[PDB]
Amino acid sequence: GEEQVRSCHLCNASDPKRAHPPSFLTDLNNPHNLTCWQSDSYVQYPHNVTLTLSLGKKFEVTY
Amino acid sequence: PDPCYDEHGLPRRCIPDFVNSAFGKEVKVSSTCGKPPSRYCVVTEKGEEQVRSCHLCNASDPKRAHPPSFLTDLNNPHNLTCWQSDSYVQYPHNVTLTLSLGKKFEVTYVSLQFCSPRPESMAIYKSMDYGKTWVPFQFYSTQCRKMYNKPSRAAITKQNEQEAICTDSHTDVRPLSGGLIAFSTLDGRPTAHDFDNSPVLQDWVTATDIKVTFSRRDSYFYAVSDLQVGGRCKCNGHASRCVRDRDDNLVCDCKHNTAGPECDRCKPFHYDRPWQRATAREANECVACNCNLHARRCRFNMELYKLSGRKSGGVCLNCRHNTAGRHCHYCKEGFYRDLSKPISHRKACKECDCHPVGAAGQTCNQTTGQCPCKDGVTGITCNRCAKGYQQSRSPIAPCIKIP
Amino acid sequence: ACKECDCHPVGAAGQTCNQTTGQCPCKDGVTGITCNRCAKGYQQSRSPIAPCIKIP
Numbered sequence: 249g250e251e252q253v254r255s256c257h258l259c260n261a262s263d264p265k266r267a268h269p270p271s272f273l274t275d276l277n278n279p280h281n282l283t284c285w286q287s288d289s290y291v292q293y294p295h296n297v298t299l300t301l302s303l304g305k306k307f308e309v310t311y
Numbered sequence: 312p313d314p315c316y317d318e319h320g321l322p323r324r325c326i327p328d329f330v331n332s333a334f335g336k337e338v339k340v341s342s343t344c345g346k347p348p349s350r351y352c353v354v355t356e357k358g359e360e361q362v363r364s365c366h367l368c369n370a371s372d373p374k375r376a377h378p379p380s381f382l383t384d385l386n387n388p389h390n391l392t393c394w395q396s397d398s399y400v401q402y403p404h405n406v407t408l409t410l411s412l413g414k415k416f417e418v419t420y421v422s423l424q425f426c427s428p429r430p431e432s433m434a435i436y437k438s439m440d441y442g443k444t445w446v447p448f449q450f451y452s453t454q455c456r457k458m459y460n461k462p463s464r465a466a467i468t469k470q471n472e473q474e475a476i477c478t479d480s481h482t483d484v485r486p487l488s489g490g491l492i493a494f495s496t497l498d499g500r501p502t503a504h505d506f507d508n509s510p511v512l513q514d515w516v517t518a519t520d521i522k523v524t525f526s527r528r529d530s531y532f533y534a535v536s537d538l539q540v541g542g543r544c545k546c547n548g549h550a551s552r553c554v555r556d557r558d559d560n561l562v563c564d565c566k567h568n569t570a571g572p573e574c575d576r577c578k579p580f581h582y583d584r585p586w587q588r589a590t591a592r593e594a595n596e597c598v599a600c601n602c603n604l605h606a607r608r609c610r611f612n613m614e615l616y617k618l619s620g621r622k623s624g625g626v627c628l629n630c631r632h633n634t635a636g637r638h639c640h641y642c643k644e645g646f647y648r649d650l651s652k653p654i655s656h657r658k659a660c661k662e663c664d665c666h667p668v669g670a671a672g673q674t675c676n677q678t679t680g681q682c683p684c685k686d687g688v689t690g691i692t693c694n695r696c697a698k699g700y701q702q703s704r705s706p707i708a709p710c711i712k713i714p
Numbered sequence: 715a716c717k718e719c720d721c722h723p724v725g726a727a728g729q730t731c732n733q734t735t736g737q738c739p740c741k742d743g744v745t746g747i748t749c750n751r752c753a754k755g756y757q758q759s760r761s762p763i764a765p766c767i768k769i770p
């Protein structure tokens with residue numbers, strides 16, 4: 249409405265349903281069962297925030 | 312699974328189901344026929360007048376034995392189990408039977424089944440201790456006064472709903488045999504509907520041990536076929552059942568972070584909000600202390616919880632990992648906060664690695680780790696030279712101005 | 715086989731245990747491996763700096 253409210257949760261990768269793998273980024277995106285991958289916290293500039301993935305085929309990209 | 316947790320694994324009140332209590336246990340008594348072997352005669356009504364039968368009592372005769380197990384065994388309404396007392400006895404004399412339980416309970420039903428006629432004067436007792444202290448509960452007589460100095464069918468004042476009443480009701484015979492006595496303490500109590508918020512009634516139901524003492528040509532005696540009393544194991548709504556101990560001791564498996572065999576207190580290291588009873592509105596649970604993974608023992612003060620707007624009052628003791636505070640939540644004198652590390656990192660505290668020369672003091676901003684920068688030096692550990700400031704090999708002053 | 719150091723948060727003068735002996739930094743009258751107990755002739759005190767002190 250007008251003010252703030254903060255919830256809170258936890259992450260065990262060994263907990264499948266409580267894990268947040270990058271597969272949450274590659275899986276089908278349900279607007280009703282979204283798949284939130286999660287980063288580590290307490291992080292900011294100045295630091296490299298790098299994620300990697302190679303292709304194996306050259307492409308032209310639009311979207 | 313566990314009724315202590317909702318469909319969403321939310322801690323909710325979990326309670327043992329309502330069960331009969333006085334079923335199958337042994338009782339030490341003060342009198343019984345048959346030692347030496349005793350006899351007894353029995354009267355019956357026929358049409359309009361009377362007729363008297365008669366029998367014998369040897370406990371060494373199993374078929375002529377009638378143990379108190381006959382009160383606790385299953386009583387078949389077609390195969391009754393009547394225990395019998397000695398005869399030729401009456402007021403003034405204690406006809407006392409005891410039962411020491413060891414656990415405090417809340418009771419709803421107290422049912423009875425008689426093989427002897429209903430006498431006139433008697434009362435109720437209990438022990439919220441383990442067979443040492445004894446307090447009455449109610450009286451029962453036509454002359455509650457001449458016998459017990461009591462009124463018959465007194466009123467239950469709201470200001471003391473823990474009154475002990477006496478009545479002549481159902482002190483009549485018929486019923487001689489098969490007397491049915493059921494007692495609900497909740498009768499008459501105005502604050503019985505909201506029992507969840509009736510602690511005095513939640514205290515009036517508290518009972519651990521039970522004692523029953525009686526006052527009030529022919530052989531007259533007393534006999535009874537069975538006993539049933541319903542209740543639920545008192546875990547304050549914090550355990551759905553009660554189990555045996557490794558040393559044979561029935562205790563609640565106190566859930567909801569509660570302690571004591573009855574869930575009466577909070578668990579060790581659970582001192583932030585006071586101990587409370589699970590309500591239909593809120594399970595008013597206990598809560599451990601917050602140390603952010605930096606302590607194992609804690610204490611509490613109400614004023615902390617008081618001034619918290621009644622929200623929290625926990626405080627940790629002996630904050631490890633170079634941490635400190637009520638939540639063991641800051642680095643002591645000597646480190647700084649490694650802000651890069653998470654807020655609960657066990658090594659979030661590290662020595663003020665201040666440039667032992669370039670920093671002016673031996674400390675650093677516990678938040679920033681900003682070491683004490685000397686005259687023209689800046690930087691957290693104070694190492695760098697400034698614009699127009701040339702570093703010198705002097706172990707005292709490196710950066711030097713430009714003309 | 716390896717568990718994090720459990721140095722007595724007060725009675726040990728550090729949070730690092732003697733990885734061989736696990737002996738935390740026991741301060742003058744503090745004893746115990748994690749440096750928690752006070753020694754015989756040292757009673758626990760509520761002072762946040764001197765927990766264990768000799769007696770005259």
Ligand SMILES: *[C@@H]1O[C@H](CO)[C@@H](O[C@@H]2O[C@H](CO)[C@@H](O[C@@H]3O[C@H](CO[C@H]4O[C@H](CO)[C@@H](O)[C@H](O)[C@@H]4O)[C@@H](O)[C@H](O[C@H]4O[C@H](CO)[C@@H](O)[C@H](O)[C@@H]4O)[C@@H]3O)[C@H](O)[C@H]2NC(C)=O)[C@H](O)[C@H]1NC(C)=O
Nearest residue numbers: 257258259260261262263264265266267268312316320604
């Ligand atoms: C990561 O996220 C997951 C998912 O939420 C959490 O899951 C935990 O998983 C562990 C798995 O070990 C669970 O531990 C459970 O408790 C047992 C306690 O020891 C008893 O073991 C058996 C009964 O299981 C008894 O006969 C015995 O006498 C002990 O009394 C563990 O021993 C069990 O795990 C054991 O099983 C595996 C095989 O399945 C064996 O290889 C091992 O020996 C292993 O010890 C048992 O599964 C625990 O219940 C789960 N916690 C939950 C669901 O909250 C993790 O907790 C979480 N990790 C972190 C660090 O948060």
Ligand SMILES: *[C@@H]1O[C@H](CO)[C@@H](O[C@@H]2O[C@H](CO)[C@@H](O[C@@H]3O[C@H](CO[C@H]4O[C@H](CO)[C@@H](O)[C@H](O)[C@@H]4O)[C@@H](O)[C@H](O[C@H]4O[C@H](CO)[C@@H](O)[C@H](O)[C@@H]4O)[C@@H]3O)[C@H](O)[C@H]2NC(C)=O)[C@H](O)[C@H]1NC(C)=O
Nearest residue numbers: 345346347348349350367368369370371372373374375376
């Ligand atoms: C309290 O209640 C009990 C149980 O009902 C009654 O117990 C009595 O129990 C005894 C058995 O202990 C019964 O006695 C029976 O009668 C025999 C009579 O003596 C003859 O014995 C044999 C045949 O049995 C002959 O060869 C012999 O020549 C005698 O003529 C007893 O001898 C028997 O008891 C023997 O058996 C037990 C084991 O069962 C042994 O340990 C003993 O040696 C014992 O002698 C036989 O069993 C008797 O019937 C019961 N009395 C009854 C039912 O009234 C008590 O009597 C009762 N109390 C009172 C005061 O009545």
Ligand SMILES: *[C@@H]1O[C@H](CO)[C@@H](O[C@@H]2O[C@H](CO)[C@@H](O)[C@H](O)[C@H]2NC(C)=O)[C@H](O)[C@H]1NC(C)=O
Nearest residue numbers: 288291292293294295296297298299300301651
């Ligand atoms: C953070 O910054 C860059 C990537 O964003 C990395 O660059 C390094 O640069 C130094 C300077 O010569 C090289 O010696 C290193 O080999 C480089 N690292 C590489 C190429 O991986 C730097 O390493 C990053 N630091 C991290 C990721 O911890």
Ligand SMILES: *[C@@H]1O[C@H](CO)[C@@H](O[C@@H]2O[C@H](CO)[C@@H](O)[C@H](O)[C@H]2NC(C)=O)[C@H](O)[C@H]1NC(C)=O
Nearest residue numbers: 341403404405406407408443445522523524525
């Ligand atoms: C009969 O009355 C009560 C129980 O109904 C018993 O109370 C006794 O009171 C005297 C008074 O000093 C004490 O010395 C006794 O120790 C009490 N007896 C107990 C506590 O068992 C009295 O003893 C009863 N008489 C009996 C059982 O023979």
Ligand SMILES: *[C@@H]1O[C@H](CO)[C@@H](O)[C@H](O)[C@H]1NC(C)=O
Nearest residue numbers: 264265266278280281282283
């Ligand atoms: C989303 O999908 C997962 C797939 O296992 C399922 O477990 C979960 O219940 C789904 N979400 C909801 C709200 O049902």
Ligand SMILES: *[C@@H]1O[C@H](CO)[C@@H](O)[C@H](O)[C@H]1NC(C)=O
Nearest residue numbers: 373374387388389390391392
């Ligand atoms: C009642 O139960 C006892 C238990 O053994 C049995 O001996 C007796 O025959 C039963 N009586 C009837 C009428 O069923």
Ligand SMILES: *[C@@H]1O[C@H](CO)[C@@H](O)[C@H](O)[C@H]1NC(C)=O
Nearest residue numbers: 675676677678679680681682
């Ligand atoms: C630490 O740095 C902050 C950053 O501005 C400063 O405000 C504060 O006074 C410094 N000292 C502390 C927090 O003790």
Ligand SMILES: *[C@@H]1O[C@H](CO)[C@@H](O)[C@H](O)[C@H]1NC(C)=O
Nearest residue numbers: 731732733734735736737738
């Ligand atoms: C660990 O304990 C031993 C036992 O005497 C001691 O000699 C040593 O100095 C301690 N510290 C170490 C090994 O760092």
